[PDB]
Design a protein around this ligand. Structure first.
Ligand code: PTY
Ligand code: HEB
Length: 890
C-alpha cells in the first residue's frame, strides 16, 4: 500500500532531487568527456548502472506522485497524457538498450556477404572442459587506450568457476604488425597464471589463436576485439561508382546500386544514393564510407525495435502539449484569466562600370539555360543561385547577381583575386594562411605558386569519413571544395549551358566553347560561323564596354543569342511571358523583407504593454487598434504575395521545404489576426512565431541552395527543428528579462505604493506563462533532433555535446515549474530568482559548449551582479499569490 511508499517519501520533494541528480550527472559527463577525450566518459556515466536504476526510480516516483495527488480522481486528462508519454519514452529507451544491435557491413564486388562487424569491442574466453566441450563467454570490457579497467567477471560451470583479472595496456604496435599487447592474469583451482592478450587489428580476430593454456579443464582461449553477427539474407554490389568534380579530380557523390537475395526468394535490386537508405528487414543500412580501392563500400547498420514505441511517445507528447495549452483549468489558461481579471584590367571602378547599366541584364535575364541537374531555368535564377552559394551574402559589394556573373565571366582574372568564397572555420583558413577574422577567401589563395591545389589532400582524406557525425572542420573542407569547383565552372564558360545539341529535345545543351569545337565543327551545323561570330561579338563588346560604357553591342548580341535559342529549341522553350513572370516574382517576392517586421512589431508592442502593467493601468485601446491594423496590412501583403507565389509557381503548397514553412508562418499570423482581436500579447506571440519561422525558412534557401548532384540540408525535420529551438530560446530570454525586472521591482516596494505589489503578481504570472511556452517548445524541439538523426544520418539520440545540455535546460526548467508544489509561500520572489538563474543553462547550450567542446570573467561580471541583486532584494520578499482581487489588490 502507498503508506510505505510515503515513508519512502516519493513526492515532489524527491522528484526534484532525482531530476537534479540526473542533470548534474549528464552535465559532469561533458567535462569528463573533454578531459578524458574518449568513450571513458560513457564508461563512467552514460552506460553505467547509475541511470539503469535511476530511470526506474524516476518512473515509479512519477506514478506515485500522480497517485498521491489523486490526479485521476480529478479529470485533468491532458496533463496525464503528458506524463503518460515520458513513461513511454523512457521505457522505449530501456528496450533500446538491450536490443540495439550495431555494426558495419563491408560490401565488396561479388562477395555475397552475410556478416555485420560490430564496432562494440569485446574480449573472448573459452575453455574446453575436460569433456572437450565448448563453454564460452563474451565480455564487453570496452577499454581502448585512455582507460584500462580491472575486469571482474568470473563465470563458468563445467567445474570450479573461472576468475579473471586485467593489468595493463603494454602495447608495442609497429604498423607492420598490430601489436596491441596487454597483460592479464587468470585463476583456476590451484592453477592461476599470467597471460598476454595482444589484440589484433580492428578488422577481425584471427591471429589471437594463442591458446595460452592446455590442461583439460584448464585449456584456454583468449581474444580481444570485434565480433560478427549473421543476417538471414545475403547482400552484394552491382557496381560501385564515385564521380569527381572536373576541376579538382575530387570526389562528388557515392553510389552503390546493390542487390539483395536469398536461397529461394529471387534477388531484389536496390539503389542507394549517398543520402538514401536500404530497409528490407528490421535492419536499416546507411552508406557511410568507401574503400580507397573503389571496389567496395561500407554500410552503417542498426536495428532497434524500440523505435515505434518511442515514436508513439513523441506523438503522445505533441498531442498533450497542444491540448494542455488550451484546456481550461490548465495553469496557462488560468494565469491568462488572472491577467484578464487585473486588466590591363584593373579592379577599381569596375564595380561601377558593371553596376550603373542594367540594360543588358534586363534581357540577359531572359535567356534560357540548363542547370545540368536536368532542369531548364531562366538565367536570372541560375546566376542568383550560383552567386548565392559562392557568396552567402544576398548581395555582394554591389552587382545584383547577374551583374557579378557577367563580370566574373568576361573580366575573370580580376574577380580571381577578389575574396568571393565564404569560409566558416578559422582552422581551414589556417592552411591557406591570412588567419585573421576573415569571412572570405580569394580563388588565387587555394593554389601554391605552383599549380598545386593545396586543399586537395585534406578533402580527399576527409570525404572518406565526412558523411557521419564529424567535426565542423570535416564539413567546411568539403563545402569549400564544392564552392571552389563551382567558381571554376563559372570561369572558362562551363556554366553558360546555352546551345542545344540537337533540334529534337535530346537535351544536353552544350557549353559555348566545346559547342563550336565539337557539335558545331564536327557536324555540318552551318550555324557555326553565325554562332562563332555571335559569341566573339559578345566578348568583344563586353571587353570594350568597361572602357566606353555605351556597350549596347552586347545587348544586340544577347538578342541574337535569344533568337537563336528561340528558333533552335523545341517544346522545352518556355514562353517569354512565363519567363518574364518568373523573374518578376523573383524580384518582387516579399519573404526576404518580411523577416524583420514580424519581430520588430511584436517587440515594440510587448514593451509598451510591459510599461502599461508596470503601472497597473491598462493601455488605451487606441494602440491595440493601431498595431492590429499594422498586422492586418502585413498579413494582407503576405497572403497576396503567397497567393501570387502559388499562381506563378506550380509548387503545390505541399511544396518544397522553403514554401512549406512560409505556409506555416502564414497559418501562425492568421491564428494571430483571426482569433485574437482581443489581447495584444496574442499578436506579439503570433507575430514572433511567424517571424522566426519565416526567417529560418528563408535562411534555409540561402546556404542550402542547390548546385548540381549534391544533396543539401532541406529536410523538413531539420528546418522545423531549428525554427522551434530558436523560438524557444527567444521565449526563454524573454523569461529571463521579466524575472530580472521582478527582482528589480522588489527593491522599489516601500509600503507607500502597494500598486507595485499587484504589478509584481502580474509580472510573475506573465513570466510563468512565457516559461511554460518555452519549456514545451524546447521539449518538442529537442526530440525532433532525435527524430531527424534517426531518419537521416544514423542510429538515434545519442549522448552528444550540446544535446545533453539541451536536456539539462529541459530538466532545470522542469524543476522550476513544478517547484510550485514544494515551496510553500513567497512564490513570486522565489520564482523570479530561479527564472533568472536557470537562464545559464540556455546560455551554456548556446555559447559555452562552443568553448568547452579558462576564466572569461565577463560571466563573473554578469553573475556577480545577478547575485548581489538577489541578495539585496531578498530583504523585502514577503508576498503571496491569491487569485481573487482588484485595484489595491491584484
Ligand atoms: C515491442 C517490444 C516489447 C518488448 C517487451 C516489453 C518491454 C520490456 C521493456 C524492458 C525495459 C528494461 C529497461 C528499462 C529501464 C531502462 C532505463 C534506461 C533507458 C536508456 O537509457 O535508454 C537509452 C536510449 O537513449 C535515450 O535517448 C533515452 C531517452 C532520453 C532519456 C531521458 C528521457 C527523455 C527526456 C525526458 C526525461 C525526463 C525529463 C527530465 C530529465 C540507452 O542508450 P543508447 O541510446 O546509447 O542505447 C544504445 C547502447 N548501445
Ligand atoms: C514536459 C515537461 C515536463 C517534465 C519533463 C515533467 C516531469 C515531471 N513532472 Fe510534470 N508537468 C508538466 C511538465 C513536465 N513535467 C506540465 C506542463 C504540468 C502541468 C502543470 C499543472 O497542470 O499543474 C505538469 C504537472 C505535474 C504535476 C501536477 C499534476 C497534478 O495534478 O498533481 C506533477 C505532480 C508533476 C510531476 C512530475 C514528475 C515527477 C516529473 C519527473 C518525470 N508534473
Amino acid at each position: 500500500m502507498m503508506n510505505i511508499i510515503k515513508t519512502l517519501f516519493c513526492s515532489m520533494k524527491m522528484v526534484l532531487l532525482l531530476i537534479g541528480i540526473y542533470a548534474t550527472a549528464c552535465g559532469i559527463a561533458t567535462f569528463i568527456e573533454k578531459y578524458e577525450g574518449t568513450l571513458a566518459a560513457r564508461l563512467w556515466v552514460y552506460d553505467a548502472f547509475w541511470f539503469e536504476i535511476l530511470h526506474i526510480w524516476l518512473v515509479a516516483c512519477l506514478i506515485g506522485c500522480f497517485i498521491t495527488s489523486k490526479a485521476w480522481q480529478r479529470k485533468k486528462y491532458a496533463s496525464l497524457l503528458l506524463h503518460a508519454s515520458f513513461i513511454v519514452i523512457i521505457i522505449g529507451a530501456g528496450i533500446t538498450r538491450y536490443y540495439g544491435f550495431e555494426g558495419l557491413m563491408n560490401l565488396r564486388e561479388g562477395q555475397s556477404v552475410n556478416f555485420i562487424s560490430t564496432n562494440t569491442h569485446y574480449i573472448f574466453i573459452q575453455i574446453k572442459n575436460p569433456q572437450g566441450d565448448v563453454e564460452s563467454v563474451r565480455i564487453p570490457t570496452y577499454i581502448d587506450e585512455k582507460v584500462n579497467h580491472k575486469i571482474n567477471q568470473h563465470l563458468t560451470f563445467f567445474g570450479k568457476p573461472l576468475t579473471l583479472h586485467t593489468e595493463e595496456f603494454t602495447a608495442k604496435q609497429v604498423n607492420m604488425s598490430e601489436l596491441f599487447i596487454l597483460n592479464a592474469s587468470i585463476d583456476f583451482l590451484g592453477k592461476n597464471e599470467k597471460t598476454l592478450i595482444m589484440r589484433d587489428g580492428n578488422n577481425a580476430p584471427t591471429k589471437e589463436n594463442i591458446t595460452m593454456l592446455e590442461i583439460e579443464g584448464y585449456k584456454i582461449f583468449l581474444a580481444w576485439g570485434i565480433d560478427n553477427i549473421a543476417l538471414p539474407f545475403s547482400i552484394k554490389l552491382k557496381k560501385f561508382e564515385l564521380e569527381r568534380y572536373p576541376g579538382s579530380n575530387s570526389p562528388a557523390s557515392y553510389t552503390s546500386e546493390v542487390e539483395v537475395l536469398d536461397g529461394q526468394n529471387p534477388p531484389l535490386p536496390f539503389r542507394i544514393f549517398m543520402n538514401n537508405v536500404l530497409d528490407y528487414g528490421g535492419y536499416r543500412f546507411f552508406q557511410s564510407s568507401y574503400h580507397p580501392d573503389e571496389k567496395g563500400s561500407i554500410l552503417s547498420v542498426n536495428n532497434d525495435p524500440g523505435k515505434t514505441p518511442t515514436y508513439i511517445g513523441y506523438a503522445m507528447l505533441i498531442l498533450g502539449v497542444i491540448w494542455l495549452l488550451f484546456d481550461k483549468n490548465g495553469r496557462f489558461a488560468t494565469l491568462g484569466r488572472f491577467l484578464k481579471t487585473q486588466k590591363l584590367q584593373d579592379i577599381p571602378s569596375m564595380i561601377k562600370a558593371l553596376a550603373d547599366t542594367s540594360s543588358l541584364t534586363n534581357d540577359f535575364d531572359r535567356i534560357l539555360v540548363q542547370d545540368f541537374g536536368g532542369r531548364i531555368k531562366p538565367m536570372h535564377t541560375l546566376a542568383n543561385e550560383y552567386i548565392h552559394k559562392l557568396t552567402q551574402q544576398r548581395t555582394f559589394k554591389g552587382l545584383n547577381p547577374s551583374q557579378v556573373f557577367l563580370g566574373m565571366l568576361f573580366y575573370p582574372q580580376e574577380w580571381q583575386s577578389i575574396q568571393m568564397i565564404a569560409t566558416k572555420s578559422p582552422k581551414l583558413r589556417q592552411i591557406l594562411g591570412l588567419d585573421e577574422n576573415q569571412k572570405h577567401i580569394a580563388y588565387i589563395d587555394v593554389f601554391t605558386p605552383q599549380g598545386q591545389y593545396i586543399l586537395q589532400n585534406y578533402v580527399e582524406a576527409a570525404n572518406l569519413k565526412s558523411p557521419s557525425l564529424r567535426d565542423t572542420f570535416e564539413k567546411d573542407v568539403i563545402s569549400v571544395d564544392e564552392r571552389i569547383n563551382y567558381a571554376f565552372l563559372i570561369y572558362t564558360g562551363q556554366v553558360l549551358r546555352i546551345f542545344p545539341d540537337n533540334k529534337s529535345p535530346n537535351n544536353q545543351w552544350l557549353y559555348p566553347l566545346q559547342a563550336i569545337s565539337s557539335a558545331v565543327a564536327q557536324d555540318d551545323t552551318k550555324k557555326a560561323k553565325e554562332l562563332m561570330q555571335i559569341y566573339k561579338k559578345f566578348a568583344q563588346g563586353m571587353q570594350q564596354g568597361i572602357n566606353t560604357h555605351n556597350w549596347q553591342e552586347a545587348a544586340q548580341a544577347t538578342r541574337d543569342i535569344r533568337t537563336f535559342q528561340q528558333n533552335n529549341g523545341g517544346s522545352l522553350l518556355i514562353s517569354p511571358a512565363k519567363v518574364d513572370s518568373e523573374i518578376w516574382l523573383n524580384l518582387y517576392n516579399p519573404f526576404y523583407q518580411l523577416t524583420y517586421p514580424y519581430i520588430f512589431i511584436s517587440i515594440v508592442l510587448f514593451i509598451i504593454v510591459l510599461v502599461g502593467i508596470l503601472k497597473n493601468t491598462p493601455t488605451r485601446p487606441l494602440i491595440h487598434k493601431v498595431f492590429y491594423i499594422l498586422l492586418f496590412a502585413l498579413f494582407i501583403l503576405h497572403t497576396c504575395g503567397l497567393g501570387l507565389r502559388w499562381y506563378v509557381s506550380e509548387h503545390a503548397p505541399w511544396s518544397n521545404a522553403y514554401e512549406s514553412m512560409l505556409y506555416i508562418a502564414w497559418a501562425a499570423i492568421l491564428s494571430g489576426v483571426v482569433f485574437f482581436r482581443r489581447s495584444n500579447l496574442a499578436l506579439c506571440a503570433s507575430s514572433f512565431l511567424a517571424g522566426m519561422t519565416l526567417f529560418v525558412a528563408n535562411l534555409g534557401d540561402m546556404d542550402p541552395q542547390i548546385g548540381n548532384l549534391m544533396p543539401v540540408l532541406k529536410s523538413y525535420w531539420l528546418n522545423i527543428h531549428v525554427s522551434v529551438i530558436t523560438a524557444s530560446y527567444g521565449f526563454l530570454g524573454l523569461c529571463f528579462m521579466l524575472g530580472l525586472i521582478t527582482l528589480i521591482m522588489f527593491l522599489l516596494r516601500n509600503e507607500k505604493r502597494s500598486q507595485v505589489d499587484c504589478s509584481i503578481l502580474s509580472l510573475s504570472a506573465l513570466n510563468e506563462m512565457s516559461m511554460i511556452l518555452g519549456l514545451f517548445l524546447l521539449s518538442v524541439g529537442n526530440f525532433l533532433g532525435g527524430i531527424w538523426a534517426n531518419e537521416s544520418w544514423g542510429r538515434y539520440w545519442g549522448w552528444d555535446s550540446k544535446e545533453t545540455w539541451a536536456l539539462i535546460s529541459i530538466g532545470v526548467y522542469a524543476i522550476i515549474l513544478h517547484l510550485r508544489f514544494v515551496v510553500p509561500k513567497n512564490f513570486p520572489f522565489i520564482f523570479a530568482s530561479a527564472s533568472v538563474i536557470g537562464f545559464f543553462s540556455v546560455l551554456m547550450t548556446y555559447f559555452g559548449v562552443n568553448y568547452y567542446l579558462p576564466v572569461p570573467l565577463w560571466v563573473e561580471l554578469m553573475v556577480a551582479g545577478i547575485i548581489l541583486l538577489i541578495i539585496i532584494a531578498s530583504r523585502k520578499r514577503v508576498l503571496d499569490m491569491p487569485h481573487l482581487h482588484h485595484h489595491h489588490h491584484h
